[PDB]
Amino acid sequence: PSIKLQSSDGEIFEVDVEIAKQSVTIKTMLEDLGMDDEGDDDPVPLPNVNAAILKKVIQWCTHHKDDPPPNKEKRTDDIPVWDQEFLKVDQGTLFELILAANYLDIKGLLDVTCKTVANMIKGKTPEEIRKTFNIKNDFTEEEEAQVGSTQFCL
Amino acid sequence: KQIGLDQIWDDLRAGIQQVYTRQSMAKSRYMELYTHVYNYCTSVHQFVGLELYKRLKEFLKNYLTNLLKDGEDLMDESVLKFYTQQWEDYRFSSKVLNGICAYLNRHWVRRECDEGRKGIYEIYSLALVTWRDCLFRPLNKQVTNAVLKLIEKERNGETINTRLISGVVQSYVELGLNEDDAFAGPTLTVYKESFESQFLADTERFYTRESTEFLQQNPVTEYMKKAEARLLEEQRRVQVYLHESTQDELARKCEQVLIEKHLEIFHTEFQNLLDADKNEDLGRMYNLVSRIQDGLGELKKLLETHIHNQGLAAIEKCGEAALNDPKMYVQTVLDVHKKYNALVMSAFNNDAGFVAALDKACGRFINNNAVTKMAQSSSKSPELLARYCDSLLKKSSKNPEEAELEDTLNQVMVVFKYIEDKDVFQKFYAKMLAKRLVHQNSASDDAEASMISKLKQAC
Amino acid sequence: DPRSTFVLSNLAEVVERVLTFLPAKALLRVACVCRLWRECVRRVLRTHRSVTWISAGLAEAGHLEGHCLVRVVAEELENVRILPHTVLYMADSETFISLEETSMETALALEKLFPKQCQVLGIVTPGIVVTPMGSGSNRPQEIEIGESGFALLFPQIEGIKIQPFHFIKDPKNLTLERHQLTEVGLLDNPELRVVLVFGYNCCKVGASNYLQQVVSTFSDMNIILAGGQVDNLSSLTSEKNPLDIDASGVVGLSFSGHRIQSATVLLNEDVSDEKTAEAAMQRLKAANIPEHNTIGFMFACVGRGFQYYRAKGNVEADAFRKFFPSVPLFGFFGNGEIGCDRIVTGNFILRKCNEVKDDDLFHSYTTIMALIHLGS
Amino acid sequence: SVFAYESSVHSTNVLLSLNDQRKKDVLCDVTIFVEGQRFRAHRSVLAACSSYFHSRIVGQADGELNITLPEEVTVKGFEPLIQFAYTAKLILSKENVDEVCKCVEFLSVHNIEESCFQFLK
Amino acid sequence: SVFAYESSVHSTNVLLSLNDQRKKDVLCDVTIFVEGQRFRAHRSVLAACSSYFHSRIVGQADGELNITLPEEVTVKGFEPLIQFAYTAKLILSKENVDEVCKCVEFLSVHNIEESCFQFLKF
C-alpha cells in the first residue's frame, strides 16, 4: 500500500493507503474511481492545504490508526493525552487544522480540535470572547436587546 | 470571498460532463472538481442560494433526454442491450458524482432539508429520481414486453444470456422509490408493478398452453413427470432472475396452474395406478399433491376403498377349506397387510393420515368379511385367529426355530388390533389353553408367558 | 489577525460542531456572540430529543444546613445538556418541614433555579423510588423513609405537548362545569393518550370522594391513568395563585401526542414472591413497547415493600430491569392507587370491559407500573 | 373478566385494499356506464356511501349490472366521487368544484361536509 | 388549488354499513361453513381482511362459492374474529383466548397482532 499526496505549495509526501483511508474524502475517490490501472505513482495534489499542515494531519493519523469507529454519548472532556500535546500550537495553525479536517472530512480530527475551541469558549462571557477571536459587532442593538433577552435563566 | 459563483460553471461542466462517458478520470483532476464545489459551498457573497442543485438537475436531464433519442425507435433484443449497458454507465458514473459534490451532500441537503421544503435529495439519490425520465419513457412497456419474450424461451431456447436480464431486474429493484420518506425496509415497490405483475400473467399462459396440450396427446404418466421438472425449473429460474420475494409467490402461481386445477383426472388415474403394482409413479404423484392442500385428503378414501375391494378377494380365493384350516384365514389377511403396508410406508412417505387408510379399512374386512358371513358369526373371526396361535404354540414334531416363535406371534399381534371384539379371543384361547397346561403340550414356557406379556401390552 | 475572523464567523458548519460540545447553560451564553452564532444555537437546541433525569441518593446525607436534593440540583444543573421545558420532581416528606410544615423556603428554592419559562409541578410523597444518574443500566434503588428525590427534565420534543393541570377543592361550590377539562386538555383532545393523575390531602371525607368524582369527568376514554394519593404539594407554575398548604386537590401531567405509546400492569394481592412478580412484568414485555426513549413509573402502597414481601427490598425494581434491559424507573410510595390493565399504542387499544361502573381504577394495597414511550 | 381489542387502523387498511381491488379486475361485480366510458366498482361500498345507489342496488338479483347515471352527472365531477368513496380523500380544483358539489347534493353521499364552500380562491 | 378533503369518519361508517348489510343479508354473496353454523359475509371484505380468503376467493365465478373450514377451527373462535373483521373490535373472554388466537394463524387476518394477547390476566 503506497499513495503519494501533493500539498498546495508543491511538496510531496508519501503516506500509507490505509492511513489515508482514515479520511473519507481520500478513500471515496480511491475506492469508487481507483479501481483501474493507476497513473504511475501519480501524486494527488490537494490544492487547499500547504506543506506544514499536511504533516500535522498525517502526524495525527499516524497515532490514531488503531481506533475502532463505533458513538452517541453525552458530550464530555475526555480529550486523550496525545491530542492537547499535539494541539499546543499558536492560534492560527489550529484554525488551519479545522479547514484541513473539514476539507478532507476527518471526523476524529474535527471532533478533537472543536473540543479545545469549545473549551476555550467555555468559562467566558459573550462580550469578552471577541477580544480573542475578533468577531464583528452587530445588528440592531434592539434585536440583541430583545433577543439576547430570552434566556440566562437556566 | 475568493470563490466567485459564475467562473465555476465553466470548468465544472468540463469534467462533470467528462465523468459521464467514462474515460479514465484521473485522480489528479478529481480533487480539482472537489476544490471547486467545496469553495462554491464555503463563502459569503452565501452558498449562492441553491442554484448549484438546480444546475445539476438540468445537466442530468440533458444527458437523459438527448440520450432517449437513440433507443426509443428500437425493437426487442436491442432495447435489452441498451438498458443494461447504459445503466452501468450511469450507476457507476453517477456515483463519482456522489463525492465530487460531497460538501453539497453533507451540509446543504441535510440543512436545506429537515427544515422548510421538499424536493431535496442526495445527488446520487437525485440521479435515480431523474432516471425516471428514461424509465417512465420506453422500457416500462418496451423491455417488460421484451424480457418476457426472452424469458419465454423455457421451451427449447438455450443460452438465455442471463446477464442482460439480470441487469434489468436489478435495475427495477434499484429504482425503488427513494422519493421523500427518509434514508431508511426493502425497495421492491417499482418491481411489482413492472416485472412481477406483468411476468406472472405471462407465465400462466405459457403453462396453460402446454398443460392442456400434453394431456391430450400423451398419457397422464408424463404430466406426472413434466410437472416435477417444470415446478423445479421454475425454482431455478429464480437465483439468476432475482431479488427474491418471488420464490414463495411464483411457485404457488405455478402450482395451481399445473396440478391444482387438473385434479379431475388424477383420481381417475389413481385407481388405474393402484390396480397395477406400480410403486414409483405414486411417489411422484404423492409429491405433486403433497405441495397442494385440499385434495391430499381426497386420494385417501380411494386407497381406503381399494384394499377393502382387495381384501375380500384373497379370502374369497381362499375357498371353502378356510373354515377348517386355521392357518389360511390368518396368512391370507396377513399378506394383504404386508404389501399395502409398504405402499403406505415407501410410496406415501409414511403419512400419519395415510396409515389410517391401512388402518380401519383393514378393520372392515376382518370383522364383517367373508367366511365369517358364510358360517354366520362376526365372532368367528377371532376364533380362527385363536386357533392359529395355539396351533403353532403347541407341543408338535419340533419347535424348529426360536426366532419363528417370536415373529409369528409378533405378526399375530398386528392383526389383533383390528378385530374390534376381544371377548371371543379370551374365551377360545383360554379353553384350549387349559388343555395345553394340563397336558404340558407346549414348548419354551417363556414364549406363551411372552404372549400374555404382549396381551399385557394389549387389552 | 488569525484566520478565524473569517472561519469562526462565516463558516456555518464549523460553528455548529462547536456549540454542541458545551453545557446547556453555556449554549445560551454564546447565543449573544454575534448574529450567525444565534442561528447556530437555535439549530443545536433543536436536535435535543432525549429526556434527562437528576436524582439525590442516600449516600449524600451531609450534616449541613440544606436540602439534599437542592444541593444536587444546584451542582448538576451546571452540567445539564438539554434545556428543560416541563419538570416533575418528588421528594420524601421530611425534607419540606423546618418548623412544623418553611415549606416555601425549600419549595421556592427549587422553583428559582429552574428557568422562568419552564413549567414546574411540585409533589411530595412519603417515599421515593428512583434510578441514579448515568446510563439506563443503573440498578434502581427503592428508598423508604429517608431523604431522597428526583427531578425529571423534559426537553422540547416535536409533536408532543405536555400541560399541567390543577383542580383545587372547595368549601362549597360546583364540581367542574366543563371548561377546565378543555382549558388544559383532558377532554375534546383527539390525541390524549397518557395521564398521570395525582392526589393529595384526601384524608377528609368528601376529599376522599373528590378523587372519586373528578376522575370520572375525563375517564372512559382511550387513555392510561396512573398515580395515586400523596401528602401535599410544593410548587406549581401558574403565576396566579399563592399555593395554600392546607387545601386538597388533584394535580398531574397530561401527556398528548401522536406517537406516545403506553402500557400498564396491576400488581394485585396475588403476587407475594420473586417468581410471581417476575411473571407480572413478563406480561409488560409482551406488549412490544419499544426500549429507547421510554421512562417507567411505579406507584405503590406504604403497606408494600419490606413488610409485605418477606424480608426483602428492591424486588419490584430488580424485576423491572430483569426483563427490561435499559429503561429507567421513577415512582413514589403513597396511600392510594390508580390504574388498570390497558395498552394504548398507535394502532390498538386493549381496554377492560369493566361493565359495572368504574370499579377498575381505585385499588388499594397494590402497585401500578407504566411504560410511557415519550417520543419516537 | 372480559377484555376488548379496539383497533384504529383496520378501517383504513381494509378500505385501501378494497380500493386496490377496485383498481384490479377481480372481485369487482358492478360497472358504472357513464357518458360512454366505463367505471367498475363494488356492490358493497356503493350501497354504503350514498342513497341513490342504495335505492337502486337492493332487491335486484345478482349478475351483470349497468347502473348508468343517465345524463345529469358529469365525468370530471364523477371521478373524484368514487375515489372519495373508496379511499376517503378528495381532489378539488378551481375548475372542478362546481360539478363535484352538484354530484354530492344529487347522490347524497354521506361523511362529506359542505366544507368545500369557501376553500377556493 | 388542490385543497383535498380528509374525513376521519368515512371509514368507520363504511365498515358499520358493511356490518349492517351483513346482518340482514343485504347483498351477501358468500356463504362459509364452520362445523355447521352457517355464516354470511361479503366476498370483497374477506378478500382483503384475511390472507386465506384471498387465495380461496380469487379465480372463481360470480356464482356463490360455499367455502368450508376444517374442524381445526371452531365456532367459538370465529364469531369473535369475523365480528372484528367487520367492526374492528374483538371481544375476549376466558374460553375465547386460546381458540381465537389459534384461528389467526390459519387465516393470517391482517392488522391484528397475536403477541398482545399474551398480556391478559383472565
From Swiss-Prot, chain A:
<dbReference type="GO" id="GO:0005813">
    <property type="term" value="C:centrosome"/>
</dbReference>
<dbReference type="InterPro" id="IPR016072">
    <property type="entry name" value="Skp1_comp_dimer"/>
</dbReference>
<dbReference type="GO" id="GO:0140677">
    <property type="term" value="F:molecular function activator activity"/>
</dbReference>
<dbReference type="Pfam" id="PF01466">
    <property type="entry name" value="Skp1"/>
</dbReference>
<dbReference type="GO" id="GO:0006513">
    <property type="term" value="P:protein monoubiquitination"/>
</dbReference>
<dbReference type="GO" id="GO:0005654">
    <property type="term" value="C:nucleoplasm"/>
</dbReference>
<dbReference type="GO" id="GO:1990756">
    <property type="term" value="F:ubiquitin-like ligase-substrate adaptor activity"/>
</dbReference>
<dbReference type="GO" id="GO:0031467">
    <property type="term" value="C:Cul7-RING ubiquitin ligase complex"/>
</dbReference>
<dbReference type="GO" id="GO:0019005">
    <property type="term" value="C:SCF ubiquitin ligase complex"/>
</dbReference>
<dbReference type="InterPro" id="IPR011333">
    <property type="entry name" value="SKP1/BTB/POZ_sf"/>
</dbReference>
<dbReference type="GO" id="GO:0008013">
    <property type="term" value="F:beta-catenin binding"/>
</dbReference>
<dbReference type="InterPro" id="IPR016073">
    <property type="entry name" value="Skp1_comp_POZ"/>
</dbReference>
Swiss-Prot record, chain B:
<dbReference type="GO" id="GO:0031625">
    <property type="term" value="F:ubiquitin protein ligase binding"/>
</dbReference>
<keyword id="KW-0488">Methylation</keyword>
<keyword id="KW-0945">Host-virus interaction</keyword>
<dbReference type="GO" id="GO:0009887">
    <property type="term" value="P:animal organ morphogenesis"/>
</dbReference>
<dbReference type="GO" id="GO:0006513">
    <property type="term" value="P:protein monoubiquitination"/>
</dbReference>
<dbReference type="GO" id="GO:0016567">
    <property type="term" value="P:protein ubiquitination"/>
</dbReference>
<comment type="function">
    <text>Core component of multiple cullin-RING-based SCF (SKP1-CUL1-F-box protein) E3 ubiquitin-protein ligase complexes, which mediate the ubiquitination of proteins involved in cell cycle progression, signal transduction and transcription. SCF complexes and ARIH1 collaborate in tandem to mediate ubiquitination of target proteins. In the SCF complex, serves as a rigid scaffold that organizes the SKP1-F-box protein and RBX1 subunits. May contribute to catalysis through positioning of the substrate and the ubiquitin-conjugating enzyme.</text>
</comment>
<comment type="similarity">
    <text>Belongs to the cullin family.</text>
</comment>
<dbReference type="GO" id="GO:1990452">
    <property type="term" value="C:Parkin-FBXW7-Cul1 ubiquitin ligase complex"/>
</dbReference>
<dbReference type="GO" id="GO:0005737">
    <property type="term" value="C:cytoplasm"/>
</dbReference>
<dbReference type="GO" id="GO:0097193">
    <property type="term" value="P:intrinsic apoptotic signaling pathway"/>
</dbReference>
<dbReference type="GO" id="GO:0005634">
    <property type="term" value="C:nucleus"/>
</dbReference>
Swiss-Prot record, chain C:
<keyword id="KW-0833">Ubl conjugation pathway</keyword>
<dbReference type="InterPro" id="IPR019494">
    <property type="entry name" value="FIST_C"/>
</dbReference>
<dbReference type="InterPro" id="IPR001810">
    <property type="entry name" value="F-box_dom"/>
</dbReference>
<dbReference type="GO" id="GO:0009267">
    <property type="term" value="P:cellular response to starvation"/>
</dbReference>
<comment type="subunit">
    <text>Directly interacts with SKP1 and CUL1. Interacts (via C-terminal) with KDM4A. Interacts with TP53. Interacts with MTOR; this interaction promotes 'lys-27'-linked ubiquitination of MTOR.</text>
</comment>
<dbReference type="GO" id="GO:0005634">
    <property type="term" value="C:nucleus"/>
</dbReference>
<feature type="modified residue" description="N6-acetyllysine">
    <location>
        <position position="169"/>
    </location>
</feature>
<keyword id="KW-0963">Cytoplasm</keyword>
<dbReference type="InterPro" id="IPR036047">
    <property type="entry name" value="F-box-like_dom_sf"/>
</dbReference>
<protein>
    <recommendedName>
        <fullName>F-box only protein 22</fullName>
    </recommendedName>
</protein>
<dbReference type="GO" id="GO:0032436">
    <property type="term" value="P:positive regulation of proteasomal ubiquitin-dependent protein catabolic process"/>
</dbReference>
<dbReference type="GO" id="GO:0006913">
    <property type="term" value="P:nucleocytoplasmic transport"/>
</dbReference>
Swiss-Prot record, chain D:
<comment type="similarity">
    <text>Belongs to the bZIP family. CNC subfamily.</text>
</comment>
<comment type="subunit">
    <text>Heterodimer of BACH1 and MAFK.</text>
</comment>
<protein>
    <recommendedName>
        <fullName>Transcription regulator protein BACH1</fullName>
    </recommendedName>
</protein>
<comment type="function">
    <text>Transcriptional regulator that acts as a repressor or activator, depending on the context. Binds to NF-E2 DNA binding sites. Plays important roles in coordinating transcription activation and repression by MAFK. Together with MAF, represses the transcription of genes under the control of the NFE2L2 oxidative stress pathway.</text>
</comment>
<feature type="domain" description="BTB">
    <location>
        <begin position="28"/>
        <end position="94"/>
    </location>
</feature>
